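In the previous chapter we treated chains in isolation. Here, by contrast, the input contains four separate entities that must be folded as one system, with a combined length of 186 residues.
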Amino acid sequence: STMEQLSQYLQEALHREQMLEQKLATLQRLLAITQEASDTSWQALI
Amino acid sequence: STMEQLSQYLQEALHREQMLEQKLATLQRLLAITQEASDTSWQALI
Amino acid sequence: TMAIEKILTDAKTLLERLREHDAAAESLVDQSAALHRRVAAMREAGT
Amino acid sequence: TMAIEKILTDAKTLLERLREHDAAAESLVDQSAALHRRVAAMREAGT
């Protein structure tokens, strides 16, 4: 059945896209703590 | 028509997902040149 | 009861999440660009 | 000629691109983690 195969593709595309977002959210936080990790060194150079 | 509205949603989801990938590719290159930009400073500290 | 009622909702939801996450990736680009600028300025201030 | 023939191909293509780009995001996570490690080690080596 194509309309049971559809509903699988879409439901699994939605699942995989929530996986992707979870990686993007991890990226956002990794970049933020890297930005703040540089602050002390950057201040030391004025 | 739902099967003309479908085909729009999907075709536009494919378009927007190529937009997203173009941003991810820009991210990859920005991170790479940031990694290499740190090399000289890191070497200066041994 | 019909099928598409849940498919169309899923495709509509799929595209909306792609839109807000494509924006999220855009803000990531600027995040990493700001980090790039900061790392490059530390190097030039060490040269 | 029927509709779904192009829809099913599009949904199948949509999910496959999401899979390879979800992997791409995974490699980005490790990229930025390596950068994090390098920035933190520069700070600790300056402390």
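Chain C has one domain: 1-47. The CA atoms of residues 13 and 21 of chain C lie 12 Å apart. Compare these points with the single-chain example from earlier in the chapter.
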